[PDB]
Amino acid sequence: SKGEELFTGVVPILVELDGDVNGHKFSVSGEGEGDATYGKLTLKFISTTGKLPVPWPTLVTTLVQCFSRYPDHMKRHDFFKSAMPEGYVQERTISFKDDGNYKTRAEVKFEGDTLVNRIELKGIDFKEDGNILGHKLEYNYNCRSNVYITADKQKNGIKANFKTRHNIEDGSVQLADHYQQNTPIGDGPVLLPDNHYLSTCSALSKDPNEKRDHMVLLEFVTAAGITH
Ligand SMILES: [Mg+2]
Ligand SMILES: [Mg+2]
Tell me the structure's resolution in angstroms, rounded to a single decimal.
1.3
Tally of domains within the chain: 1
CATH of the domain at 225: 2.40.155.10
Residue ranges making up the domain that contains 185: 1-228
| Residue 181 CA to ligand 1 centre (angstroms) | 28
One DSSP character per residue, the chain reads -TGGGGGSS-EEEEEEEEEEETTEEEEEEEEEEEEGGGTEEEEEEEE-SSPP-S-GGGGTTT--GGGSB--GGGGGG-HHHHTTTT-EEEEEEEEETTS-EEEEEEEEEEETTEEEEEEEEEEES--TTSTTTTT-B-S---S-EEEEEEEEGGGTEEEEEEEEEEEBTTS-EEEEEEEEEEEESSSS----PPSEEEEEEEEEE--TT--SSEEEEEEEEEEES---
Distance 32 CA to ligand 1 centre (A): 13
Ligand positioned closest to the Cα atom of 27: 1
